[PDB]
C-alpha cells in the first residue's frame, strides 16, 4: 500500500530547471560551437543515451566541459535541452531538421518518433 | 504560442535519476541521520524539500559533503521520505506514520505531511 503524488514528478523537475536559470549545482558547460550551456550532468545522463554513455565510460566520466560534434548547430541544441528540463517541444517544419538530427546525436528516441510523425504528416 | 508536451518525460527523468542514485552515480552528499548514512544528489534534495533548499542554498553549505539531520530524526522515517523523493510514491503504514510525519515535517515538505494528517484521520 502506497500513495502516488501524481505531479511530484513533474514538480521536481520543475525546480530543477529553476536551479539551472540560477546555474545553481550545474556541474557541466556543454560547448555547441559557438554557444555555452550549463546543465546537471544527472538530468543531462536521465535524458539523453549519448550522455548517459559519455558520463558511464572511463574515458569522459568526470569533464566538466564537453564539445559535441561540429555538425551539432546551437539552436537545436538549446531545443532539446530546455525540453529535458520542462518535458516540452516547440516543433515547426523551420526546425524539424536540427530538432531531428540533434535528438538522434543526443538518442533521444521519443523526439525522434514525434519528430518522424511530423515529417511524414506534413 | 503552443507547443508539444511529453506527459511522462518528467516521471521517467525520476526514475533514470533514482537508478543513478541507486548506483552511486553523481551522488554529491551523505546524510548521517543518527547511526545511519544516506548518499544522495543535492539537487534531488533541493527539489523536494525546504530544509535541503535553505542549506544547500548556501554554497558554503553545497559545498559539505557530510551533513548530520537533527540527532532525534528516526533514520527509517528518512529512508521512507528518501525513497518518496526520487519515486513519487510514499509507503505509509500505521507502523509508520509517527516517524514519516515528524521527518517529513524536519524536511519541510508539506504534501507529505498533510497526507499523513488525512492518514491519521481515517485511521
Ligand atoms: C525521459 C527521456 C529519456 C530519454 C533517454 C534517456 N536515456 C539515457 C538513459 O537511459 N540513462 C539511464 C539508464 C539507466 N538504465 C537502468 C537499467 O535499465 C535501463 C537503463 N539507468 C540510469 C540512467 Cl541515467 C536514453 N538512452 C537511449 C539509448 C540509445 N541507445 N541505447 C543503448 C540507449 N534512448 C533511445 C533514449 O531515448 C534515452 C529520452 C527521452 C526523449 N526523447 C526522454 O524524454
Ligand atoms: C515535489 C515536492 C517538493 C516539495 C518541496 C520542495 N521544496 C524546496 C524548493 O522549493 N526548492 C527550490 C525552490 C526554488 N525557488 C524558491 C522560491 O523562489 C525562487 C526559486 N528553486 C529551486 C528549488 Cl530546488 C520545498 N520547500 C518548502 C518550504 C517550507 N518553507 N519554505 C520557505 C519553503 N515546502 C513546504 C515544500 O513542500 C517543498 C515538497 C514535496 C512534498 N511532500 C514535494 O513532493
Redesign the interface.
Known amino acids: 500500500?502506497?500513495?502516488?503524488?501524481?505531479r511530484?514528478?513533474?514538480?521536481?523537475?520543475l525546480?530543477?530547471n529553476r536551479?539551472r536559470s540560477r546555474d545553481?549545482?550545474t556541474?557541466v558547460v556543454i560547448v555547441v560551437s559557438r554557444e555555452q550551456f550549463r546543465a546537471?550532468?544527472?538530468?543531462l545522463?536521465?535524458?539523453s543515451g549519448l550522455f548517459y554513455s559519455i558520463?558511464?565510460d572511463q574515458l569522459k566520466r568526470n569533464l566538466s566541459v564537453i564539445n559535441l560534434d561540429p555538425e551539432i548547430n546551437p539552436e537545436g541544441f538549446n531545443i532539446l535541452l530546455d525540453?529535458?528540463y520542462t518535458?516540452?517541444?516547440?516543433?515547426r517544419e523551420g526546425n524539424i531538421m536540427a530538432v531531428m538530427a540533434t535528438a538522434m546525436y543526443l538518442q533521444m528516441e521519443?523526439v525522434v518518433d514525434?519528430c518522424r510523425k511530423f515529417i511524414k504528416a506534413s
Open positions: 500500500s502506497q500513495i502516488q503524488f501524481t511530484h514528478a513533474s514538480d521536481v523537475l525546480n530543477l536551479l545553481i549545482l556541474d546537471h550532468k544527472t538530468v545522463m536521465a535524458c558520463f558511464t525540453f529535458m518535458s516540452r517541444l516547440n516543433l521519443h514525434t
